[PDB]
Amino acid sequence: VLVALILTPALCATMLKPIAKGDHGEGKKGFFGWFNRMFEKSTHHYTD
Amino acid sequence: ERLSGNQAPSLYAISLIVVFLCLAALYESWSIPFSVMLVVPLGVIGAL
Amino acid sequence: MPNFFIDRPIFAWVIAIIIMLAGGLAALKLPVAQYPTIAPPAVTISASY
Amino acid sequence: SVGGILRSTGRYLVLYLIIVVGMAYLFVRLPSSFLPDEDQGVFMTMVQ
Ligand SMILES: CCCCCCCCCCCCO[C@@H]1O[C@H](CO)[C@@H](O[C@H]2O[C@H](CO)[C@@H](O)[C@H](O)[C@H]2O)[C@H](O)[C@H]1O
Ligand SMILES: CCCCCCCCCC[N+](C)(C)[O-]
Ligand SMILES: CCCCCCCCCCCC
Ligand SMILES: CCCCCCCCCCCC
Numbered sequence A: 001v002l003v004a005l006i007l008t009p010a011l012c013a014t015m016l017k018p019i020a021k022g023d024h025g026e027g028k029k030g031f032f033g034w035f036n037r038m039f040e041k042s043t044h045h046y047t048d
Numbered sequence B: 001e002r003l004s005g006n007q008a009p010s011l012y013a014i015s016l017i018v019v020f021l022c023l024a025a026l027y028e029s030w031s032i033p034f035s036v037m038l039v040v041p042l043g044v045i046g047a048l
Numbered sequence C: 001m002p003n004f005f006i007d008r009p010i011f012a013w014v015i016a017i018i019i020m021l022a023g024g025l026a027a028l029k030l031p032v033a034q035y036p037t038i039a040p041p042a043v044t045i046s047a048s049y
Numbered sequence D: 001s002v003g004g005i006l007r008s009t010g011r012y013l014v015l016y017l018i019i020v021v022g023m024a025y026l027f028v029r030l031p032s033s034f035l036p037d038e039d040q041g042v043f044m045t046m047v048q
């Protein structure tokens, strides 16, 4: 919890890339594109 | 005398490194710490 | 506290490196064993007739 | 004086490296001990 309150916020703010509004990694190609499509689909199944 | 001996450089090495890090936190700079740490010889020369 | 270290990432890194150095140095000079002392202590009186 | 020193820089970088080499020299030649052998108003003579 100390790392998540001290270091993790500092790393997220500095060394994390900007994600464009709308992008949920569905646009990505290869395996991760399929996993993001599958997961965003399963998230809708789950909520409903 | 046999059971260990001369762990002084070992401990004064990490002493410099922790002083460096603490100063790095004080000034929020990886470089400004050196402006302080270079005075170490100025005291030691007169003692010697 | 998080807002503080978002602006001060080097301070945040310094706390992490000191913890790791403190740990790494402690880890080298820790005892090693399978278990701690778990068996209860016992005293034996030995006599002979 | 310092205003003048900050126009020089390179001259005083050499003075510093001389002081460090001077410090380094004196440290190696200076013999080491643990604790001074003090007069305690008493001593013993062994006869064997
Ligand atoms: C006693 C211990 C011996 C170890 C060394 C200790 C440090 C030396 C003691 C401080 C003396 C500094 O003295 C100071 O020197 C600088 C030059 O270097 C002079 O500065 C002068 O020359 C420089 C360039 O050469 C010009 O840019 C400057 O405008 C001019 O005033 C100062 O006018 C003088 O007051
Ligand atoms: C392992 C403990 C680390 C101590 C962290 C010190 C937090 C200082 C931040 C002060 N403040 C709450 C005002 O931001
Ligand atoms: C133990 C190694 C510490 C590394 C610190 C690196 C600090 C830079 C953060 C990344 C910048 C993009
Ligand atoms: C982890 C994703 C959960 C998916 C839940 C799907 C359930 C659908 C069944 C509908 C039956 C009426």
Ligand SMILES: CCCCCCCCCCCC
Pocket (backbone or CB within 6 Å): C024, C025, C027, C028, C029, C030, C031, C032
């Ligand atoms: C520098 C890396 C430290 C972390 C590894 C600790 C291993 C401890 C070994 C036990 C020696 C008695």
Ligand SMILES: CCCCCCCCCC
Pocket (backbone or CB within 6 Å): A029, A030, A031, A034
């Ligand atoms: C564009 C390449 C697509 C790769 C498909 C990933 C494998 C699917 C695993 C079920």
Ligand SMILES: CCCCCC
Pocket (backbone or CB within 6 Å): A001, A002, A005, C001
């Ligand atoms: C260890 C708990 C920290 C709480 C700070 C808000």
Ligand SMILES: CCCCCC
Pocket (backbone or CB within 6 Å): C001
């Ligand atoms: C904000 C101070 C928290 C202290 C953690 C031990």
